[PDB]
A paper describes a structure:
Mpf2Ba1 is a 53.2 kDa protein isolated from Pseudomonas monteilii through a multi-step purification process informed by artificial diet bioactivity screening against WCR larvae. The protein is comprised of two domains—an N-terminal MACPF domain and a C-terminal β-prism domain. Pore-forming proteins (PFPs) are a major class of soluble proteins that oligomerize into rings and undergo large irreversible conformational changes to become transmembrane assemblies and breach the membrane of target cells. We have identified and characterized the non-Bt insecticidal protein Mpf2Ba1, providing mechanistic details for how it effectively kills the devastating maize pest WCR by forming pores in midgut membranes targeting a different binding site than the insecticidal proteins currently deployed in commercial transgenic maize hybrids.
A major finding that facilitated Mpf2Ba1 structural characterization is that gut fluid extracted from WCR larvae is necessary and sufficient to induce oligomerization in vitro in the absence of brush-border membrane vesicles (BBMVs) prepared from isolated gut tissue. Upon incubation in gut fluid, an N-terminal cleavage after Lys25, as determined through Edman degradation sequencing, and subsequent oligomerization step are triggered by interaction of monomers with yet unidentified midgut component(s). After gut fluid-induced oligomerization, Mpf2Ba1 monomers formed higher-order complexes that were isolated via size exclusion chromatography and imaged by cryo-EM. The 3D reconstruction of ring-shaped oligomers at 3.1 Å resolution revealed an intermediate state of Mpf2Ba1: a 22-mer pre-pore that is 80 Å in height, 260 Å in diameter, and encircles a 120 Å-wide lumen. By fitting and refining the X-ray structure of Mpf2Ba1 into the pre-pore map, we discovered that we could model the entire protein in the density without breaks, except for the 30 N-terminal residues, five residues more than the 25 identified biochemically. Upon N-terminal removal via gut fluid activation, these contacts are lost and residues on one side of the MACPF domain become fully exposed. The MACPF domain in the Mpf2Ba1 pre-pore remains mostly unchanged, except for loop Val52-Val57 that moves from an external position, in contact with the uncleaved N-terminus, to a buried position in the oligomeric structure, as measured from the accessible surface area per residue. Moreover, it seems that the loop is re-oriented by ~7 Å to bring the highly conserved Ser54 from a solvent-exposed position in the monomer, in contact with His18 of the N-terminus, to a core-buried position towards the MACPF domain in the oligomer. The pre-pore β-prism domain is rotated ~15° clockwise relative to its position in the monomeric structure. This slight rotation disrupts the only interdomain H-bond between MACPF and β-prism, involving the carboxyl oxygen of Glu137 and the hydroxyl group of Tyr460.
Author numbering:
A (entry chain L), B (entry chain M), C (entry chain N): 31 to 484
Amino acid sequence: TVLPGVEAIGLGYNPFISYASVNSGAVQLFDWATAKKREVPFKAGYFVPEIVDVQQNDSATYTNVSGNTISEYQRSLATSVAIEGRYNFFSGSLSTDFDSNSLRNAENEFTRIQQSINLWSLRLPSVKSLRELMLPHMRQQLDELNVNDPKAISRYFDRVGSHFLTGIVMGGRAILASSTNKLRVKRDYSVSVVAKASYEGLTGQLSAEAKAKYGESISSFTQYSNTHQEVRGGDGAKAHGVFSGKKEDFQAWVDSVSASPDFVDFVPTIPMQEIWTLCSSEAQAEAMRKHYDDVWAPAQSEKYRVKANYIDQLVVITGGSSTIEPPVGYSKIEYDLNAGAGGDFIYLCYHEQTWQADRPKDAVTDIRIIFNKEPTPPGYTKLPQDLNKGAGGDDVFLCYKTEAYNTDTAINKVTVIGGNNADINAPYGYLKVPGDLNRGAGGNFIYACTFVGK
Amino acid sequence: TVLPGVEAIGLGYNPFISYASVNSGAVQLFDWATAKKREVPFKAGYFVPEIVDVQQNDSATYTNVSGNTISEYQRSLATSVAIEGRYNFFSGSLSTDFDSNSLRNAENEFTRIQQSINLWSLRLPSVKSLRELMLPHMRQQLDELNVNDPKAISRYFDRVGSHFLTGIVMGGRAILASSTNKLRVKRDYSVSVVAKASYEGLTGQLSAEAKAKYGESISSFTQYSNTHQEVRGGDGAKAHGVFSGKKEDFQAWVDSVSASPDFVDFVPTIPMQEIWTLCSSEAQAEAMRKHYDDVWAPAQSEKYRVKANYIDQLVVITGGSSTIEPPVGYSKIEYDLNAGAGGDFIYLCYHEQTWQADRPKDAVTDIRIIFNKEPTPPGYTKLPQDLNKGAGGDDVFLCYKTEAYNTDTAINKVTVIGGNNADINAPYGYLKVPGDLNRGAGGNFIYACTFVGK
Amino acid sequence: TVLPGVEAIGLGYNPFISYASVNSGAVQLFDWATAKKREVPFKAGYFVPEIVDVQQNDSATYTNVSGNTISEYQRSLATSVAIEGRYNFFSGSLSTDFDSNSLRNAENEFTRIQQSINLWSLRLPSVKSLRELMLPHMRQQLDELNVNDPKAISRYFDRVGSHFLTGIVMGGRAILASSTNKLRVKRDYSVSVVAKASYEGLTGQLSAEAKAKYGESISSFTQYSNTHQEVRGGDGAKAHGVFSGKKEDFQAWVDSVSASPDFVDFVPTIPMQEIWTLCSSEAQAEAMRKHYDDVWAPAQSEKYRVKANYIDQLVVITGGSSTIEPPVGYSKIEYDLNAGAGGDFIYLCYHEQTWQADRPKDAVTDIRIIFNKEPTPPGYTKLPQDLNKGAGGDDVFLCYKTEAYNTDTAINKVTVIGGNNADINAPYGYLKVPGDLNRGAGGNFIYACTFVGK
Ligand SMILES: [Mg+2]
Ligand SMILES: [Mg+2]
Ligand SMILES: [Mg+2]
């Protein structure tokens, strides 16, 4: 009887596809049916190939990743494992942890809370005899790889993986992933704290005193965030009970992870080894390593870089009540451009465009206010509504310029801010336009603020 | 005893016919009865051919695909699998996920929510010895393929498939597919969020707090969308219970998927391999690969491109009450062209034509308003009803031009918008015609808006 | 023990006779008693000939076909299977899905809702060794076919079929076929939506919320349509329970399909192969293929083309009450030709003739109104009743021309439309005649509208 996980160690792995999942590896490079076995010291009746070192490490454990923005989350994710380079490792998990719009939505900040239920971990040393344990066809394929063609190496890394697993933890994990509107959730605590506290709440691990302390903070987090939930290892008939809010259901799953563990986490010291560790020629290793970091890992990292949504069109709507509503394609900035100035209610509305590789639109890239009679600046559009309509004052018109999309300049968000002071502060990172949308009218000073993510 | 799924790995597959279904593959290329077996480490008493690598990966998992338009959904679907080129892969599933009119209806946006219930996954390496495992008649047929005739290669890809499966996940899946009127569903959340939340509601996975938060949003989604439901793997006598709204029925199905799993999903890293990987001559592979992407995959992708419905005829109806009703062939734009102007109620009505390959009609391609006495512009039709009938003012007449169908110019939708401002905003992507359908009359300004999908 | 369905794969098949039914195939071309067997991996204790590939695909599935007109339904039916050419494949099913008058009735639109209960599917590869498995007399008959006589080939395709089955799905199916009066059913949803929803209602699959949403729409669909119902596979003593409105009865049938499945659907990728794939001489294949598409498939497709009913005679009836009634041979257009004009009630009545191949009558092909004293136009008939009898005004008479039947010009329907506006709109695709049937009288303007299906 082989120890569970011997099938999963040595598996050829693609870092970018996913984190700590076997779906990220393509086929097993090493032959362990033929190899000499060793009995597992702590689990008599189970055997492993003598090359692997298996340590018991029974320990329920946390791995938490967070970032105020996706490009930050992608780096705190990538650095969660001892691995070389700045590449967006594990970043393929984004496509399944988070809703695709919510990755593109620049108002979100992201947290992933993973409770690993460790049981044991299998380790594989970097000794030169590893080559002798490869399956013959795998060794033959690697030995005949035509490293004189970049496409062959690139296909090899794609088809076989760039690394192979050398550190495995076998157990269970429950994960909660969440994206949270960072403009509107309560800031009393860091979102990782209320993320973890709400994860503990959903699993019932949150104590009576913590439940009171976090309990008011987690409701704000709960309503303003999209919590994806998943669970792995253990009895799938009990896996759905872990988020049942009841400790007996969570423990009933934990009591099943021991029977049927899965690959859930890496061993921090030696998670995986590069595939050219196994090739017999140093000149082959040089070509493969050179291709890996000169070409393949750059392209793979770039192909997992996520754009933000951007504004492509603005409109203004006017009417006699607070509840007037934009054309269906647009969404409304809820601050009245005549707030306190009387007259008509006026609202600024925008369209945010999803970026597309083959047909990016223009973004909006600049906005200006031109007032009474000044001509529209060269190449700007102008909205025909007077932004003091009914309010009196001077005639106010807003103009904006559109240009082909560039991440350096496509405006991601806009807002309107107003108050009694002329020197009013925009939200952090926003730039406000000069000129008052109630110039000459009564009421508040009002300014349009613009935000670019870069 | 062979492990379930050994019959399904190596199956020759057509990407375009469907996603993650065995109905998309035509016959098994590899002979695994003769081949040397290996016992499955985690399932003693089951065996596999020694070539395949089987990993346990017991993990309930989500794959979600969405798009504001079908051409977007077709690309988010195609990119849901690591596969080469921009072709409309898996796009044959459209014919069974969605109602055919609803694919043609440009007011719809599309979401597919799939919960895969994974159990294990079978992997097959790209080693050169695969050729030795092919069935002799399959190898003989591939070896004698007359690649000097494009029709022979095209028939081979059609009859045998262009790829073969190298990554298989065996388990269950429940799918909800929905098309939703994007003009009228609530925009509080992205439709993928309320799609997933309503899927969780139908399966009972939605929590008490999420049920409150989403519960008001999902009813709007529910009434304004056509949710197709299907389920695969597990006991077919319990499969219909999964959408019973009750967790005990859903779990009772999950508890049966473990006994009788099906091919439900791909392994993301190595889903399928090109068929010319197996041909012995590189000159044959060049001809097959060249034909695949120069001819066959283009034609197959194009033959899955979906037109939108288009307007081919307009009429106006007039009468003494709000509830007057068009001729049966037409449908009514519910905004009165004398709203606030008194007189007769007037409504604009249209026919939307289904596109046909052998007999496309004319579409409407331009609309104009000509008012009192100006002659009808060259080649335009004119509607005889005065669009201020009973309202006084100037005599208003609407004219439109029709031309043979072209996706670049066939108008897909029209609407009438009106309000107190002359500078009123059309819905996003609509173009409004110049001139007021109440010119000289009282009441609102009213304009006809036109939309082309391209 | 042979797997159920081995008798049905390889069966020589006629596409035109029916869809997915064994009654459409004439005798089995291949000998599988002698052939070497293979045990079915997923059903130990059942065997198949080693040539066939059997995949389990347990999946309850939908195939839906719809069209606003029969010639559209015939094409959406024909294209429901991957098969070559524009021929009216499967069109023989019309004679049993729909009432013959209702195919001829141009007011109907057609929907077929099929729920396939798949269990497994048998596949047969296009390998050259198929010829070796043919039964000797079948091979001898094909080898001696005198392809120098078109009648011999035509008789062979008629007697033996033009194709043979290569893809089989074994299971059950329940079908609802319906023809619906497209002029009078509610247009809130597409008829395929309320067809499917009412099918789900009859089988009990419609949910509580869908039952409310569709429930008012399905009653209109139900009363205005003729739903044929049939069921196939499973226990015939439980088959009639599937439309019992009760899920327990439907599931009780599904639980019996697993014991006694039938041929219910095709495998989409490889449904059937042309019969000249099996002939040994390419010169024979050329003659057979040339005959198939030059002669036989055209004639078979044409012999399944359905005419519409047409108007052959018109009469007018006059009297003192709304409820006056035509001569028994005619049916009445319910709009009074003196509506609002007082006097006598006047109604226009018509006879619609069934087309006959050996004795087509004249159709009506033109209609005119000649008023007071103008002579009857050359070759027109005239109705003697004044269409302002009792109403005063000018004397109104309707004239019509009859000509030998032609689908290009035989008028299929007529109607009378009236209202306060002179510029009133006819129903879509109708043409209204000039002149008012109340000219000089009071009341509404009234016009005769004519419709030709072509
Ligand atoms: Mg203002
Ligand atoms: Mg008007
Ligand atoms: Mg009259």
